[PDB]
């Protein structure tokens, strides 16, 4: 591009490890965290005073202190005049922009922006737009910008870990939570705080699968299905439901439980979210 310092002409290769010993790799990660316990959420508000409201969210990779994984910076921009090319809108226009930080980008040099970044925008847009009162501020717009500082797993490494979709659900859950923190910080009329919960159906043995809150695919041998839920506990409403996984219709109960635990994760995350907002004021 004209706008960036292009790297070397040749295509650079990401580091490939020596992998000298198979034995050294040894045991596969196992979820020590209880099935109903989310990661430890670190959430801060007002991290970018220049913005009308902002928040920062960070998670321990595997519930290990200091081993940081997901890192999200969110900067809500307060109701502001809409561009004049489309100068009117009866309802406040929630606009969501989600970008992986260059450090978090799948490719250090990329021909195309990740479809994943656009997708997360739509999911987050749907989740937040439900939680935001558009009627309050007609003729105005509000822009929620999420900077995915760090993913819970390195992008090029995630390709090896079964599927990126599970990571995207984890990322989306964080985006919902942090964005809600920023929205509350920005003083944007919201129907209820919305927190992002995620839960999975997993099978790490020949025994029956378990429902697990806030999963990470590396900790499980097989994720049969997962669900991400933007949930409003004070409303008992879901603004954005996202589910993926092959489930027989005979297992409708498991899906129902999977959603409920996913909502339970959202309640758990909302607990941190309210605690952070309460202490903020």
Partner 1 sequence: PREVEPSLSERQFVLQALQEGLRLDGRQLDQYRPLSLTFGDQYGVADVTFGKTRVLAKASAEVTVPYADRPLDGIFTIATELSPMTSPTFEVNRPTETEVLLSRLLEKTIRRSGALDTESLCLVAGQKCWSIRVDVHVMSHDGNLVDAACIAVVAALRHFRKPDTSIESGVLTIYTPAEREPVPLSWLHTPFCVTWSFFGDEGEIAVLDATWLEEQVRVGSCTISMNKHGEICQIAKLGGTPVEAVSLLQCTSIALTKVKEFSDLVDKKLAEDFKRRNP
Partner 2 sequence: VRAGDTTVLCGVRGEVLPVERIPLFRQPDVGRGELKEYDLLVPNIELATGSAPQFLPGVPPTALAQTLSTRVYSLLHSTRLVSAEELRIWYRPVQDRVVAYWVLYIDLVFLSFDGNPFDVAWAAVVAALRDTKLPVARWDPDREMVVCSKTETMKLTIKGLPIACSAAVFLEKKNRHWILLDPDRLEESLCKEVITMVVDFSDGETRIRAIEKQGGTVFGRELIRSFALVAEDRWKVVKEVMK
Partner 3 sequence: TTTATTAPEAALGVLPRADGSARYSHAGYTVTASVNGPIEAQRRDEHPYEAHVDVIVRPAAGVGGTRERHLESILQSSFAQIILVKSFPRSLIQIVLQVEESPENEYVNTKLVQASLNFAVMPALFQTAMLALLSAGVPMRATATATAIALASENGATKTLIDPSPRQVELAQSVHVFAFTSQDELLLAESEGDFTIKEWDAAYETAKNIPDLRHFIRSTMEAKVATDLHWKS
**What residue ranges bind partner 1 (CB under 8 A)?**
2, 9-11
155: exposed, middle or buried (C-beta count within 10 Å: 0-12, 13-18, 19+)? Answer: buried
| 85 binds partner 3, rule: CB under 8 A | no
Q: Residue 81, interface with partner 3 (CB under 8 A)?
A: no
Long-range contacts formed by 4-7: CB under 8 A, 24+ apart: 6/109, 7/108, 7/109
160 binds, among partner 2, partner 1, partner 3, none (CB under 5 to 8 A by kind): none
Report, in Å, the least distance between residue 69 CB and partner 2: 15
> Residue 228 carries which DSSP code?
E
The yes or no reply on residue 111 touching partner 3 (CB under 8 A) is no
Is residue 11 a contact residue for partner 3 (CB under 8 A)? no
Site for partner 2 (CB under 8 A): which residue of 7, 110, 138, 187? 7
Identify whether the C-beta of residue 188 lies closer than 8 Å to the C-beta of residue 92: no
Q: Tell how far CA 253 is from the center of its chain.
A: 26
- Quick check: 235 binds partner 2 (CB under 8 A)? no
> What are the residues whose beta carbons fall under 8 Å from the beta carbon of 33, sequence distance 6 or more?
39, 62, 63, 214
Q: How far is CA 87 from CA 84, 145, 152, 188, 189, in A?
A: 4, 21, 40, 21, 22
Q: Which is nearer to partner 1, 8 or 15 (CB)?
A: 8
Decide: is 64 part of the binding site for partner 2 (CB under 8 A): no
What's the DSSP call for residue 115?
H
Site for partner 2 in 79-98 (CB under 8 A): 80, 83, 95, 97
- Which stretch in 3-11, 159-167, 191-199, 250-258 sits in contact with partner 3 by CB under 8 A? 3-11
List contacts with partner 2 (CB under 8 A): 3-20, 24, 47-51, 73, 75, 77, 80, 83, 95, 97, 99, 101-103, 108, 141, 143, 145, 147, 149
């Amino acid at each position: 591009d004209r706008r960036r310092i292009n790297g070397p002409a040749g295509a650079t290769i990401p580091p490939v490890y020596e992998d000298s010993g198979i034995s050294e790799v040894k045991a596969l990660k196992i979820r020590s965290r209880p099935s109903n316990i989310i990661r430890k959420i670190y959430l801060k508000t007002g991290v970018t005073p220049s913005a009308s409201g902002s928040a920062y969210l960070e998670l321990e990779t595997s519930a290990n202190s200091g081993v940081s994984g997901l890192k999200l910076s969110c900067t809500v921009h307060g109701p502001r005049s809409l561009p004049r090319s489309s100068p009117f809108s009866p309802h406040m226009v929630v606009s969501t922009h989600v970008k992986y930080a260059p450090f978090a980008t799948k490719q250090r040099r990329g021909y195309l922006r990740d479809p994943t970044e656009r997708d997360l925008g739509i999911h987050l847009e749907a989740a937040l737009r439900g939680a935001i009162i558009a009627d309050r501020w007609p003729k105005s717009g509000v822009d929620i910008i999420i900077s995915i500082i760090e993913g819970d797993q390195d992008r090029e490494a995630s390709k090896t870990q079964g599927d990126e979709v599970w990571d995207m659900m984890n990322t989306l859950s964080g985006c919902i939570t942090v964005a809600s923190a920023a929205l509350a910080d920005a003083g944007i009329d919201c129907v209820d705080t919305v927190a992002g919960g995620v839960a999975a159906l997993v099978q790490d043995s020949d025994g029956s699968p378990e429902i697990v809150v806030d999963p990470i695919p590396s900790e499980h041998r097989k994720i049969l299905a997962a669900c991400c839920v933007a949930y409003l506990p004070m409303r008992d409403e879901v603004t954005n439901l996202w589910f993926r996984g092959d489930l027989p219709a005979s297992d409708m109960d498991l899906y129902t439980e999977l959603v409920e635990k996913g909502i339970q994760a959202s309640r758990s995350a909302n607990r941190v979210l309210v605690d952070c907002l309460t202490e903020t004021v």
